[PDB]
Swiss-Prot record:
Detected in pancreas (at protein level). The keyword Thylakoid does not apply. Its cofactor is Ca(2+); chloride. This is Pancreatic alpha-amylase. It comes from Homo sapiens.
Length: 496
């Protein structure tokens, strides 16, 4: 459950949010594999409801109609093709599994689905699976409205409808089997693991029963006995009766306190400063590192649309965002998930963005292809943060220092900190309103290193900042608070 099943030396996965299968297949071969990325989290590959009001929102993909591999991302052939090609280049595929529910109970019956499948929410009829009224929790939920009304009641959180979404009776073997049939079809296709959507809304025991029905990974690509990597999406912040620790027996869990706290520290909200990150990790009350899936922002919270609210840093806050991602990728805690988004027309009103529902770039509902510009950036409104030099190079930094201990910490009691990873890497940050100019102990062997944030090592030369480490492991760093990117990172592989 707990191992990502990535190729040795690859330590991160990237969420290619709403990307088409054909574009992901290409990205695996032309960029992801060459650049050392471990895998890709894909959007739900099963048929969902086609919502036209609002026009094809991103969240319509979280309202299942059947388990047919047919969505705006592509069909089953394109899906298998993507998995095969990515696997052949050493890049894993992790599926977003929406198994807690089907579509909204108030959705009109008909064939308004991504594959034409007929469904009738009102009568609990999903013939394409098939599911009927006996497969939902309508009779089990005890709330007056049938929806989740109070999160202080761990029971209704699990048995009632999350904002109207028809709740599956996951204790029934039939339901468990239809879910497992779907997941085993994907495992046999070649996927390496799953992101279990809305895990807080399912009983830990029901999840386990389903996982026990799962096959071992495809023996054509994975060694015998490989189990799918499982990470459960559980938003567990302040005290609530549900704890993410209740799910440790099934696999990893998303640590949403991670991005929320990193965001407030870097934004310097209410007294927090980077010097406090000295004991970042369990020391901050986070789950154990070997059970954590971490990230700065996620598709569901980068819109103020989730846990962390306004503290969350996203591509919109580019300068601070790159620094947060850099800190995460450099720090040893957890398994890292990198976000890759698309631009939407944010339109704030009374503190809230009214266009937080806007789906991916499209032409009359047809998702636009990801076009690569000559400078390696993307067109068609895809942000492609995973291609930003600062993020991509830190993804590599993590691979390079993998296994190395957290050492040589330094801080000025405010917002200028630094630390290294064994004798393989070192990173320095300046988030104060004044310049940083100091000689630090890096723990790195003597030599000239290319700063990978401002540039790259291009065959015996650096295109950006160059750092000189003396025989005793010291090196001078200068970062003005006016720098484009207020941080420097050097590692074993950027050494001249
Ligand atoms: C490094 O760049 C300089 C020119 O700036 C050039 O003289 C030298 O040959 C380069 N070294 C390599 C190995 O390309
Ligand atoms: Ca439920």
């Amino acid at each position: 459950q707990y191992s990502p099943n990535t190729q040795q030396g690859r330590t991160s996965i990237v969420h290619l949010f709403e990307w088409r299968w054909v574009d992901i297949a290409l990205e695996c071969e032309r960029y992801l594999a060459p650049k050392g990325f471990g895998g890709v989290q894909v959007s739900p590959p099963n048929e969902n409801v086609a919502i036209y009001n609002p026009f094809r929102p991103w969240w319509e993909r979280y309202q299942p109609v059947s388990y047919k591999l047919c969505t705006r991302s592509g069909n089953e052939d394109e899906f298998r093709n993507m998995v095969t090609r990515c696997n052949n280049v050493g890049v894993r595929i992790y599926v977003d599994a929406v198994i807690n529910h089907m579509c909204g109970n108030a959705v009109s019956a008909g064939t308004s689905s991504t594959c034409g499948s007929y469904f009738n929410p009102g009568s609990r009829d999903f013939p394409a699976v098939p599911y009927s009224g006996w497969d939902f929790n309508d009779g089990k939920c005890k709330t007056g409205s049938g929806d989740i009304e109070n999160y202080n009641d761990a029971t209704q959180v699990r048995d009632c409808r999350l904002t109207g979404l028809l709740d599956l009776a996951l204790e029934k073997d039939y339901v468990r089997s239809k879910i497992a049939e779907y997941m085993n079809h994907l495992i046999d296709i070649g996927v390496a693991g799953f992101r279990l959507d809305a895990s807080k809304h399912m009983w830990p025991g029901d999840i386990k029963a389903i996982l026990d029905k799962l096959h071992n990974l495809n023996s054509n690509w994975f060694p015998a006995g490989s189990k799918p990597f499982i990470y459960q999406e559980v938003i567990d912040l302040g005290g609530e009766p549900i704890k993410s620790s209740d799910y440790f027996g099934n696999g990893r869990v998303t640590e949403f306190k991670y991005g929320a706290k990193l965001g407030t520290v870097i934004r310097k909200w209410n007294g927090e400063k980077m010097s406090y990150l000295k004991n970042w990790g369990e020391g901050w009350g986070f789950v154990p590192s070997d059970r954590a899936l971490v990230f700065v922002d996620s598709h569901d919270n980068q819109r103020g649309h989730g846990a962390g609210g306004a503290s969350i840093l996203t591509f919109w806050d580019a300068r601070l965002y790159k620094m947060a991602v850099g800190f995460m990728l450099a720090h040893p805690y957890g398994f890292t998930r990198v976000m890759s988004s698309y631009r939407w027309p944010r339109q704030f009103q009374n503190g809230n963005d009214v266009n937080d529902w806007v789906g991916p770039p499209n032409n009359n509902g047809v998702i636009k292809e990801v076009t690569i510009n000559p400078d390696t950036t993307c067109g068609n409104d895809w942000v492609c943060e995973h291609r930003w030099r600062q993020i991509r190079n830190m993804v590599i930094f993590r691979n390079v220092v993998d296994g190395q201990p957290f050492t040589n910490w330094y801080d000025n009691g405010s917002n200028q900190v630094a630390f290294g990873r064994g004798n393989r890497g070192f990173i320095v940050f300046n988030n104060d309103d004044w310049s940083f100019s100091l000689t630090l102990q890096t723990g790195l062997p003597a030599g000239t290193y290319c700063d990978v944030i401002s540039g790259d090592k291009i065959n015996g030369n650096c295109t950006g900042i160059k750092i000189y480490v003396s025989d005793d492991g010291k090196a001078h760093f200068s970062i003005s608070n006016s720098a484009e990117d207020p941080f420097i990172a050097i590692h074993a592989e950027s050494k001249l």
